[PDB]
Every structure is written in C-alpha cells, then in structure tokens.
Design a protein around this ligand. Sequence first.
Ligand SMILES: [Mn+2]
Ligand code: NA
Lengths: 21, 30
Amino acid sequence: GIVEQCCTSICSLYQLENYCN
Amino acid sequence: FVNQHLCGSHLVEALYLVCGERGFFYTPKT
Ligand SMILES: [Mn+2]
Ligand code: NA
C-alpha cells in the first residue's frame, strides 16, 4: 500500500491526499 | 510538487502536512 510504495519506490503528494479524512 | 521517497515517520510528517486539519489515516501493511 501507500506506506510501502512511498518507502520502496516513490509517491506523490496527490497520492498521499487520498489518505486524508 | 515533487515526488517523494518517504519511510517511517517521514511519511507520517508528510501526511500531516498534506492533510492538515482534515486529518488522515496511517495504515501500513501487516
Ligand atoms: Mn530519518
Ligand atoms: Na507530489
């Protein structure tokens, strides 16, 4: 998931925004 | 914005900044 993606690869702030409440 | 390489608590910090007062959920794989 996002936690693994951001650490093993890269991720965008736009992808992160999907985890906001 | 630039792409990000974020591990551990650095991802939490990024979520905090992105989401602000909206809050967020942090859900690692188990
Ligand atoms: Mn560190
Ligand atoms: Na970004």
